[PDB]
Amino acid sequence: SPIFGPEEVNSVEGNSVSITCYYPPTSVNRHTRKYWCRQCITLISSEGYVSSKYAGRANLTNFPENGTFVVNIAQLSQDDSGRYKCGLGINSRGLSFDVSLEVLEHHHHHH
Ligand SMILES: [Mg+2]
C-alpha cells in the first residue's frame, strides 16, 4: 500500500469534492502519469486526458514536492457514487489506491 488516500469519501448531490492521494516523493513517481479511474476506466489524468463526462466539471493537479495530487470534482450527481482508483503510471500496473465515493441524496426542502 505505497500510495495513500481517502478509503471512503461521502458528499451530497450538488456539492464539489476533492480527493487527495499521496505517493512516495521520488523522481519516477513525481513525473510518471497520475490518474483517476472508475472501477478501471480513466476519467482524468495528468497527461492531458479528460473524459467527456468530466470535461469542465473536474480537475487533477500534481504537487511533486509534497508527493501528492488532487482531483477536484464538481456538481456531484447520483451517477458519481461508486468505486474509483487514484494511481501512478498505467492503470493495470496496480500502483494505486481504491476510493469509494458515496453521493448522499439531496432531500427536498420543506420546513
Ligand atoms: Mg439543499
UniProtKB/Swiss-Prot annotation:
Location in or out of the cell: Secreted
Where do glycans attach?
A: 59, 66
Disulfide-bond pairs as recorded: 21-86, 37-40
- What happens after mutating residue 95 to T? Disrupts the interaction with pentameric IgM
Domain Ig-like V-type span(s) in chain numbering: 1-96
What does changing residue 93 to N do? Disrupts the interaction with pentameric IgM
Q: How does it assemble?
A: Either free or part of the secretory IgA (sIgA) complex that consists of two, four or five IgA monomers, and two additional non-Ig polypeptides, namely the JCHAIN and the secretory component (the proteolytic product of PIGR). Free secretory component interacts with bacterial antigens toxA of C.difficile and eaeA of E.coli.
Q: What's its job?
A: Through its N-linked glycans ensures anchoring of secretory IgA (sIgA) molecules to mucus lining the epithelial surface to neutralize extracellular pathogens. On its own (free form) may act as a non-specific microbial scavenger to prevent pathogen interaction with epithelial cells.
Name of this protein: Secretory component
Species lineage, top-down? Eukaryota, Metazoa, Chordata, Craniata, Vertebrata
